[PDB]
Amino acid sequence: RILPEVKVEGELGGSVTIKCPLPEMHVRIYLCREMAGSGTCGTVVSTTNFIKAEYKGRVTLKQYPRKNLFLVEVTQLTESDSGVYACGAGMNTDRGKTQKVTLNVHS
Amino acid sequence: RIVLVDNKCKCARITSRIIRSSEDPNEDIVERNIRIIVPLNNRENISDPTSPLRTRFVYHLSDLCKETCYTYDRNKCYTAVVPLVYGGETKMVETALTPDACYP
Amino acid sequence: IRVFAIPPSFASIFLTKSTKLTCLVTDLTTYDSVTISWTRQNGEAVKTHTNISESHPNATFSAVGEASICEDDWNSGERFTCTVTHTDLPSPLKQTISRPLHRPDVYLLPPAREQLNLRESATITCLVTGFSPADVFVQWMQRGQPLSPEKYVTSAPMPEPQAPGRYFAHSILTVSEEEWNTGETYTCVVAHEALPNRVTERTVDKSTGKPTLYNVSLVMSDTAGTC
Amino acid sequence: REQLNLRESATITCLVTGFSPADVFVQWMQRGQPLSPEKYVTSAPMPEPQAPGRYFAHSILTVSEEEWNTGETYTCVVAHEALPNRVTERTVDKSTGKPTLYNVSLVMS
Ligand SMILES: *[C@@H]1O[C@H](CO)[C@@H](O)[C@H](O)[C@H]1NC(C)=O
C-alpha cells in the first residue's frame, strides 16, 4: 500500500530511470504497467528474458547488490500515456507488487 | 480502525468505526466491516494437496480475533516431502509449497 | 468500654502496600490503653503505635494501636492478639482477629438509550460477578489517569442467591452525555485476590457497543490461496 | 453479549436514579404474577456521587440463558412516593436488542 510517487520527465531523447526495492531474493523481479482498459496489471520487464513487443530494445534493467536496488531504465519514450508502473517480486505479479509510481513524458 | 483481528489465515478484518455524522446529537452509527477473502479453489488440508477440494467455508468471529486455515502467509512457509524411484532406491526430497516465501 | 481489632484490607496493599493490623479502643473513661501491644501465636513482637486521637466530645478518650506486619504475615494462617489495658479491670483485655475462592468475571454494560435521549449524564457500569471471597477493589481510569473516587461508586459485595460460594457487586461512573458522545477510554480496573496479576481491566467507548448498521464486504476470487 | 455466550443464566439490571427520598421498592413481574424473592437481589440506596441530595439503587435478576430464546418479558416494577402514580415499570426482551438493519456486499470476479 506504499506510494513512492516519482515525477521523472522524459522526451524521446530523454531516458527515465525508476528505482525499486531489491529484496536480493533473485527469484523474480519485475515492473508491471497497470492496464487501464482491462483494470488489471500488465508486466513489461521481469527477471525472465521476455519483453513487450512495442518496447523491444528500448528498456533495460540493472541490479545493484551493493545498494540492494533495482533500476528500470528507458532510453527512449514515445509519448505513452505513461500510466502506473509497479515494482514487484515473485512469480505472481498482482500479489508481488511492492511499490507503484506514475509520471509524465511530456512535462 | 478497531480491528485487531487481521489474521491472514481465515482472511478476516472486521474493524469498527463511528460515523462522525451530520452534526446532530450523538445519533451515531456502529459498524462491523468484514472482508473475507475466500481461496475457494484451495485444498482441505492446507499443507497436503492429496486432500479433497475444500467446499465449505466456516467463519466464526471468535477464533478469527486471536488452527486449520485457508490461505498462505507471506511471512510463514508450508513445505512437503516427496519420494521417487530412479530405479531401486527411494530417497525423500524436500520441496516448498511457498516459493519466494521460504526459498533457502 | 469499646474495644475492637480490625485486619488490613486489599484496597491498601494494592494502593500503597501497607498491610497493618489496627486496634481501635474508645468509650473508656480515663484511658483506653496506657500500653498497646500486639502478639502472635509464635510470640513475635510488633512495631510502634502512634497517631493517638484527642478525647471525644462525649467525655471520653480515643486510642489506636498499630501492628505493621509483613505482606505474608496475614496469608500464612496465623492469629493476632491486641493486648490493651484499662484502670478498672485488673486484667489486660484481649481481642483476636484472624483470616479464614473463585475467579470473578467483569462485564461492561452500555448506558441505556433512553438517558442518551435526555442528554444530562450517562452512567457507565461494570459488573463483577462470581468472585470468592468478597475481596474486590474497583477503580476507573481515563486515558491512563485514574479519576477521583467522588465521581464513581462501588457496591458492597453480596452473596449470589443461587451460588452462595460466589459473590457479586458492581461499580458505576457518571459521565456527561456529551463526553460519552465524543468518547473516552472508560476503563474499569478491578483487583481481586483470585487474579493472576491482580489485574483484569476492561474498557468501553462509543466505538464499541450494540452495532446498529453493519456492512459486510466479503469477497471471492480464485487464486488468493495466499491470503 | 459476553454474558449471553456462557449459555448458563443471564442477569437483568434494574437501575433507579435521581430520587430524593430514600426507601424505594423494587419488584420483578413476570408477565402476570410475581416471582419468588430469592430470584432477585436488590441493594440499599446510596447517595449519588454527582447529585448532592439524590440517591440511587440497583437490582439484579438471574435467569437461565435458554429462557430468552423462549421470549418472555421479565419486567421490573418500582414504587416510590415522587412518582405521579407512585408506581411505574419497564420491560426488556431479546426482541429489544435485535433491531438493526444489515448491510451486505458480495463481489465474486
Ligand atoms: C460501509 O458503510 C460506510 C459508512 O456507512 C461506507 O463509507 C462504506 O463504503 C460501506 N462499505 C461498503 C462495502 O458498502
What does this structure look like?
Chain C: Residues 1-100 are annotated as: CH3. Chain C: This is Immunoglobulin heavy constant mu. Chain C: Residues 101-208 are annotated as: CH4. Chain C: It comes from Homo sapiens. Chain C: Residues 8-98, 104-205 form the Ig-like domain. The structure is cut from a larger assembly and holds one copy of chain A (107 residues), one copy of chain B (104 residues) and two copies of chain C. Chain A has one helix at residues 93-96, and strands at residues 16-21, 29-35, 40-45, 59-64, 69-74, 84-89, 97-102. With 107 residues, chain A is mostly beta strands. Chain A has one domain (16-102): Immunoglobulins (Immunoglobulin-like, Sandwich). In chain A, a hairpin with a 4-residue loop joins β4 (59-64) and β5 (69-74). With 104 residues, chain B is mostly loops. Chain B has one domain (1-104). In chain B, 12% of the residues are buried. Chain B has strands spanning 37-38, 79-82, 93-96. Chain B contains no helices and three strands. In chain B, strands 2-3 form a two-stranded antiparallel ribbon. Chain C is mainly beta. Chain C folds into two domains: 2-97, Immunoglobulins (Immunoglobulin-like, Sandwich), CATH 2.60.40; 105-203, Immunoglobulins (Immunoglobulin-like). Chain C contains three helices and 16 strands. In chain C, strands 7, 8, 11, 12 and 13 form a five-stranded antiparallel β-sheet that branches. Chain C has a four-stranded antiparallel β-sheet with strand order 10-9-14-15, with no helix packed on it. In chain C, β9 (137-142) and β10 (145-146) form a beta hairpin. Chains C and D meet through β8, β13 and β16 of C and β1 and β5 of D. β1 (37-38) of chain B pairs parallel with β16 (219-220) of chain C. Residues 215, 217 of chain C line the site of 2-acetamido-2-deoxy-beta-D-glucopyranose.
Largest sheet of chain C: 5 strands, antiparallel
What is the CATH class of the largest domain in chain C? Mainly Beta
Which secondary-structure class do the elements of chain C indicate?
mainly beta
Full CATH superfamily name of the largest domain in chain C: Immunoglobulins
What is the CATH topology descriptor of the largest domain in chain C?
Immunoglobulin-like
Give the SSE order of chain B as H and E letters. EEE
What's the alpha carbon Rg of chain C, rounded to whole Å?
25 Å
Shape of chain C: elongated
Tell me the number of structural domains of chain C.
2
CATH architecture of the largest domain in chain C: Sandwich
Total of DSSP H or I helical runs spanning 4+ residues of chain B: 0
Number of strands of chain B: 3
Number of helices of chain C: 3
* Spatial shape of chain B: elongated
Distance between the first and last residues' Cα of chain C: 77 Å
User: What kind of assembly state do the chains in view correspond to?
Assistant: part of a larger assembly
CA-based gyration radius of chain B: 21 Å
Give the largest interface.
C-D, 34 and 31 residues
State the share of residues found in helices of chain B, binned by percent.
Answer: under 10%
Strands of the widest sheet of chain B, in order across it, are 2-3
Helix content of chain C: under 10%
Subcellular location (chain A): Cell membrane; Early endosome membrane; Golgi apparatus, trans-Golgi network membrane; Lysosome membrane
Modified residues (Phosphothreonine) (chain A): 75
Keywords (chain A): Cell membrane, Disulfide bond, Endosome, Golgi apparatus, Immunity, Immunoglobulin domain, Lysosome, Membrane, Phosphoprotein, Receptor, Secreted, Signal, Transmembrane, Transmembrane helix
Disulfide bonds (chain A): 20-87, 32-41
